[PDB]
GROMACS .gro file of N, CA and C in nm:
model
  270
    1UNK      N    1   6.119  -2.258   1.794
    1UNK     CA    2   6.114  -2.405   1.773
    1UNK      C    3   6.048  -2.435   1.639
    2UNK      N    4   6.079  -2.354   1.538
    2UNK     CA    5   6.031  -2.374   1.394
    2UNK      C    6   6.180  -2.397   1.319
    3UNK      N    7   6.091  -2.530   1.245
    3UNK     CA    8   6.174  -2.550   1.148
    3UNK      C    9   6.142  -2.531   0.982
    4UNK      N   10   6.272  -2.462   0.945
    4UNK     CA   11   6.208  -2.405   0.820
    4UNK      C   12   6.366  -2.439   0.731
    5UNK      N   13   6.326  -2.517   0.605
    5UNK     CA   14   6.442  -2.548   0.545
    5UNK      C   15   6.376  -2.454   0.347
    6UNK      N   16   6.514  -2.392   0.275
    6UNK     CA   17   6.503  -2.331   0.203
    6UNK      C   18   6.634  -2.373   0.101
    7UNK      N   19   6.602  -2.323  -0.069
    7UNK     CA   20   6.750  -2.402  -0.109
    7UNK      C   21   6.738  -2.287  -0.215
    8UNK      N   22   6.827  -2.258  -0.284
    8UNK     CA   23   6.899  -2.181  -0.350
    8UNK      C   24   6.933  -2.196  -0.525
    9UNK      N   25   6.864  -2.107  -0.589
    9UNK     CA   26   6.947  -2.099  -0.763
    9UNK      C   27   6.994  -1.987  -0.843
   10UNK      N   28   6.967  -1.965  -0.970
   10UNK     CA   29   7.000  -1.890  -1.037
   10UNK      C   30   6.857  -1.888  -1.098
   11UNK      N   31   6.826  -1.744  -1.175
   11UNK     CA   32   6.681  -1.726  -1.165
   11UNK      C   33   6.672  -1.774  -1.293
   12UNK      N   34   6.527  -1.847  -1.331
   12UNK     CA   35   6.451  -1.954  -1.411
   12UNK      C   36   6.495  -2.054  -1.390
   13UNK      N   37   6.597  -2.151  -1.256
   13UNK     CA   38   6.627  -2.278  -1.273
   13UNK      C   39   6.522  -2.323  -1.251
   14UNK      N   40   6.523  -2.475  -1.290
   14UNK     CA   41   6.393  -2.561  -1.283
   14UNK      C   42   6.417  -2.672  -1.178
   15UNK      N   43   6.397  -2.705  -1.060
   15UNK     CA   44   6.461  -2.826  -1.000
   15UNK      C   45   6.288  -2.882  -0.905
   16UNK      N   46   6.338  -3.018  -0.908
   16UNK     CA   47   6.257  -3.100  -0.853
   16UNK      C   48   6.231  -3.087  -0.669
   17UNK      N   49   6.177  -3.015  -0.598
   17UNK     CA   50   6.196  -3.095  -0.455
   17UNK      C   51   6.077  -3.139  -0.396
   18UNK      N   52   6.159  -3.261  -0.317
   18UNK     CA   53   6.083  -3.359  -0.258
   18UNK      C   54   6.147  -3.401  -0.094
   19UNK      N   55   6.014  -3.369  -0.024
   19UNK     CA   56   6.064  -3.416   0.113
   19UNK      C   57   5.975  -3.452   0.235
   20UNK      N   58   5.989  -3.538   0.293
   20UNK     CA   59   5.903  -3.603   0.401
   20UNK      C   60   5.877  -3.497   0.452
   21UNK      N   61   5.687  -3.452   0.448
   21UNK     CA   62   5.595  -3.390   0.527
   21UNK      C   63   5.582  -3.500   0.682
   22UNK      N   64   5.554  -3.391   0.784
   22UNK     CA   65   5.539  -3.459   0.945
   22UNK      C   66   5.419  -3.521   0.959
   23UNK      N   67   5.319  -3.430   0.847
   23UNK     CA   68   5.143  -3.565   0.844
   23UNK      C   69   5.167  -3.625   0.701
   24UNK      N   70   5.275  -3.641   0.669
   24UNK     CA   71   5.269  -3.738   0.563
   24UNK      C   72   5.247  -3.707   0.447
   25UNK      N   73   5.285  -3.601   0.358
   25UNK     CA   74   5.244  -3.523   0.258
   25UNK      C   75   5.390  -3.500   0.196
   26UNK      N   76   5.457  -3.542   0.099
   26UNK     CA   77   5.507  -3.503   0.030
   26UNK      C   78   5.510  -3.381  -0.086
   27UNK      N   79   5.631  -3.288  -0.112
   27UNK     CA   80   5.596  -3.187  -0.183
   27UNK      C   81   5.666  -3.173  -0.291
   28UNK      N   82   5.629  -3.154  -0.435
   28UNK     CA   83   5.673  -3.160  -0.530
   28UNK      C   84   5.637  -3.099  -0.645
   29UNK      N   85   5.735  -2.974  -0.696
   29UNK     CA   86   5.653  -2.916  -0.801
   29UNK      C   87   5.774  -2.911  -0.918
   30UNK      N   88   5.695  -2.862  -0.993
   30UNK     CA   89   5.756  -2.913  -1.153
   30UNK      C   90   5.762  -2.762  -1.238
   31UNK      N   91   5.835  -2.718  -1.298
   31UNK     CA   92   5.794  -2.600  -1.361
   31UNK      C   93   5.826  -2.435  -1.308
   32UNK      N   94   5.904  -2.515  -1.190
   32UNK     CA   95   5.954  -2.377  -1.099
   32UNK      C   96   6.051  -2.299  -1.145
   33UNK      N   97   6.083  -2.158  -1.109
   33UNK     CA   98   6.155  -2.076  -1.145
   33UNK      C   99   6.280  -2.085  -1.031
   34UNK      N  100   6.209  -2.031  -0.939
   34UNK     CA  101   6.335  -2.059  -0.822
   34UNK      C  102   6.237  -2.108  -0.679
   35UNK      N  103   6.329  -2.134  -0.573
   35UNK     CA  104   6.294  -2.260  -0.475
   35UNK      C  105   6.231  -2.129  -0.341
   36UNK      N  106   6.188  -2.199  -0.262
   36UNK     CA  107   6.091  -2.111  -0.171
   36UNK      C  108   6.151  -2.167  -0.081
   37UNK      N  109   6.058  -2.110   0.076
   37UNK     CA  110   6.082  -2.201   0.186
   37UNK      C  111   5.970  -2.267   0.263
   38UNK      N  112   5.936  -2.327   0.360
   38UNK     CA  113   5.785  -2.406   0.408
   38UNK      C  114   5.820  -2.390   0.549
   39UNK      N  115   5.729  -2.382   0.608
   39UNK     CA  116   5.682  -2.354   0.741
   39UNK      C  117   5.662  -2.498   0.847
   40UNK      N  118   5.783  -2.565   0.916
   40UNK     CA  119   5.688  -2.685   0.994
   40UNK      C  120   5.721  -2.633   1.165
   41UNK      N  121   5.604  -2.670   1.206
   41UNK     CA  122   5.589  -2.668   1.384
   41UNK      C  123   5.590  -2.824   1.400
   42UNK      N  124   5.689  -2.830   1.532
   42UNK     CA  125   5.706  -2.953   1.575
   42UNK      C  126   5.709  -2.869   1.769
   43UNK      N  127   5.674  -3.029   1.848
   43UNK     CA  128   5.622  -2.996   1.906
   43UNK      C  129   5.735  -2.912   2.037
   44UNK      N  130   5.823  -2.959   2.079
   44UNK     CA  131   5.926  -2.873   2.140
   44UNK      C  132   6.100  -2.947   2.140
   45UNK      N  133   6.134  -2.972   2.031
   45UNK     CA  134   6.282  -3.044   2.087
   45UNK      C  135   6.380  -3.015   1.899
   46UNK      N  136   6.456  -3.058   1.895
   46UNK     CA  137   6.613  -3.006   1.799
   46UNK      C  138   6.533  -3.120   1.693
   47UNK      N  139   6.473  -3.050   1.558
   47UNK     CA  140   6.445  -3.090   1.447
   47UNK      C  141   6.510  -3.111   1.313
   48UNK      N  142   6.536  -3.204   1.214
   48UNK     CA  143   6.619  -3.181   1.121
   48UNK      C  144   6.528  -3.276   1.017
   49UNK      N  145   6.541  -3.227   0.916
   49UNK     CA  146   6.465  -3.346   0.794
   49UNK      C  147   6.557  -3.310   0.667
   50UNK      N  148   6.522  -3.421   0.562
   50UNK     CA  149   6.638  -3.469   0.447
   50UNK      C  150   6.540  -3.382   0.340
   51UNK      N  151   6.658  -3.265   0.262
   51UNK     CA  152   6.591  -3.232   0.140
   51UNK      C  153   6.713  -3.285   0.055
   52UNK      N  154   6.657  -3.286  -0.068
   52UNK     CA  155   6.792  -3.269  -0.188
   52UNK      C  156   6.744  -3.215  -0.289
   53UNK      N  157   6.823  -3.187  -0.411
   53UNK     CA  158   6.789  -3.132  -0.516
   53UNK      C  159   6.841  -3.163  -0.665
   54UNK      N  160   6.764  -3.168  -0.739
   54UNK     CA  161   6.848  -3.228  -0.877
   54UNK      C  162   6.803  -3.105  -0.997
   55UNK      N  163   6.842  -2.998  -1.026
   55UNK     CA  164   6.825  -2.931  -1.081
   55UNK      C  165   6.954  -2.913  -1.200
   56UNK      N  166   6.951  -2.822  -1.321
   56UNK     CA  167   7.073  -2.790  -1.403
   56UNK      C  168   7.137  -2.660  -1.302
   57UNK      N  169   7.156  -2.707  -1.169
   57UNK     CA  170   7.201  -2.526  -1.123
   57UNK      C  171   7.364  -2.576  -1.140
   58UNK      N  172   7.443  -2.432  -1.093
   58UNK     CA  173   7.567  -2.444  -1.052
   58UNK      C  174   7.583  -2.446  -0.909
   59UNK      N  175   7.515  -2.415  -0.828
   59UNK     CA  176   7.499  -2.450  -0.678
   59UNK      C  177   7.426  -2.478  -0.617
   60UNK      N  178   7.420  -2.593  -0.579
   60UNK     CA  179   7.290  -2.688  -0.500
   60UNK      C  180   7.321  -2.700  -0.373
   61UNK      N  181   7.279  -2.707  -0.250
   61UNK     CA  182   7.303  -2.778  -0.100
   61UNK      C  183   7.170  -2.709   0.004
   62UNK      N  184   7.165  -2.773   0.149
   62UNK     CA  185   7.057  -2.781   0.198
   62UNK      C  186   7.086  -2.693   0.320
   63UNK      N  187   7.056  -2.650   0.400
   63UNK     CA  188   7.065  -2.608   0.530
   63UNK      C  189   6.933  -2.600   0.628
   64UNK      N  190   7.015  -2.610   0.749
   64UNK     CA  191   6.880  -2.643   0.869
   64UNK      C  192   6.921  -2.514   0.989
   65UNK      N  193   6.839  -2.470   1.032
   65UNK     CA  194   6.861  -2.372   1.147
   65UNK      C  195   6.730  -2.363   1.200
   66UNK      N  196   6.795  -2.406   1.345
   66UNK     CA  197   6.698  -2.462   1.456
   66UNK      C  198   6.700  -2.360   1.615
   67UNK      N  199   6.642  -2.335   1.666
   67UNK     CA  200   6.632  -2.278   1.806
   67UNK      C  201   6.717  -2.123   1.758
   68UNK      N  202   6.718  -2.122   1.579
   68UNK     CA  203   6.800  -1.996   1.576
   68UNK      C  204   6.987  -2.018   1.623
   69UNK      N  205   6.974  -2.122   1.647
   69UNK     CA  206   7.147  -2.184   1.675
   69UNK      C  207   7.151  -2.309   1.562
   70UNK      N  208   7.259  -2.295   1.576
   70UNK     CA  209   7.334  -2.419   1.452
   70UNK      C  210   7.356  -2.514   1.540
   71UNK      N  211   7.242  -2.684   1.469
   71UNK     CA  212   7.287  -2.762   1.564
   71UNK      C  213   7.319  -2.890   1.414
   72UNK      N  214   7.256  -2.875   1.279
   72UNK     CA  215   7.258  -2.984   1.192
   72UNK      C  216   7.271  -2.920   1.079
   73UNK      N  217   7.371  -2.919   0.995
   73UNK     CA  218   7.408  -2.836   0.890
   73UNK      C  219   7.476  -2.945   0.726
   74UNK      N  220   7.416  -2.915   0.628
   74UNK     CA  221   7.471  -3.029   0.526
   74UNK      C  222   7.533  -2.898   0.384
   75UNK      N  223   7.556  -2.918   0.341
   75UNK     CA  224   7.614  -2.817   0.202
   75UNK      C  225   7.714  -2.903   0.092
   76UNK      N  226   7.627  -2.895   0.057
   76UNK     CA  227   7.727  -3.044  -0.104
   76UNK      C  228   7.723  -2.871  -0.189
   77UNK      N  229   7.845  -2.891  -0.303
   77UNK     CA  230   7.895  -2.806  -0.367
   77UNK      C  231   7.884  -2.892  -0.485
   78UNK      N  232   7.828  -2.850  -0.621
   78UNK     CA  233   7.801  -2.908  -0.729
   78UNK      C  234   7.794  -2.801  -0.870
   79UNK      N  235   7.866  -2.841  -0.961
   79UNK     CA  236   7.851  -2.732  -1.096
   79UNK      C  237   7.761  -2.763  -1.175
   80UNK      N  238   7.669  -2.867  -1.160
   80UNK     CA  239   7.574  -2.917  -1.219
   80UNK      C  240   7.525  -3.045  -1.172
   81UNK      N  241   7.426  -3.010  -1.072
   81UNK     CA  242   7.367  -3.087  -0.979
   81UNK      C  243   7.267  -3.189  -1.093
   82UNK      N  244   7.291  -3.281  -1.129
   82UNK     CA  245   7.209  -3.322  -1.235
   82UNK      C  246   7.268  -3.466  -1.317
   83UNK      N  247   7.375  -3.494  -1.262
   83UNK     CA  248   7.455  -3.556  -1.344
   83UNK      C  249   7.419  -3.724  -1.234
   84UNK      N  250   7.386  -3.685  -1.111
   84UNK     CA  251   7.320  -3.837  -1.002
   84UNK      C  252   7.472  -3.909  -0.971
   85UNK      N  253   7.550  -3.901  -1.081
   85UNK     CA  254   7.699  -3.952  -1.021
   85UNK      C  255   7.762  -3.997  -1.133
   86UNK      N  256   7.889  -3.906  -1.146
   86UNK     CA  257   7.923  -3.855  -1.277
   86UNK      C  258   8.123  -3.776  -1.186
   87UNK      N  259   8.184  -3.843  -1.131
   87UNK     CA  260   8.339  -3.813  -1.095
   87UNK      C  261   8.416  -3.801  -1.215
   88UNK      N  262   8.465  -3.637  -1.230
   88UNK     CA  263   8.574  -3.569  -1.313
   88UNK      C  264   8.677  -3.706  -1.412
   89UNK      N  265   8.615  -3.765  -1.504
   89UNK     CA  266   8.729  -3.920  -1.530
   89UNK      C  267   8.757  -3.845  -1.738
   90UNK      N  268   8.625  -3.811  -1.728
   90UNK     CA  269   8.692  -3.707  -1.882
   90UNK      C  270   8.619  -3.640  -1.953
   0.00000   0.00000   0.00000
């Protein structure tokens, strides 16, 4: 019943993350090479929380795995997560 969310780059990317702590603590570091993962205990039931990422990577997206079964799953595909909204026009 741990939830543990982790995200993915290419080594020296630099990306921002930020995401609602359960006592209220937001986390955010600056200057990173590549992304880690964090440790939360909740108390017994199907957990999910919102990360994102804005880095120069070529592949950005989030994943959740809970009770060790797949119950909440997200994966955005991006060649340069960085652009905030920016559709192929030229």
């Amino acid at each position: 019943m741990h939830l543990t969310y982790e995200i993915f780059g290419p080594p020296g990317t630099v990306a921002d993350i930020s995401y609602f702590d359960v006592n209220s603590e937001p986390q955010r570091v600056d200057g990173a090479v590549l992304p880690w993962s964090l440790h939360i205990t909740t108390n017994d039931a199907a957990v999910m929380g919102n990360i994102v990422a804005q880095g120069n990577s070529d592949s950005i997206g989030c994943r959740i795995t809970v009770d060790g079964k797949v119950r909440a799953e997200r994966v955005s595909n991006e060649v340069n997560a960085y652009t905030y909204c920016l559709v192929k026009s030229a």
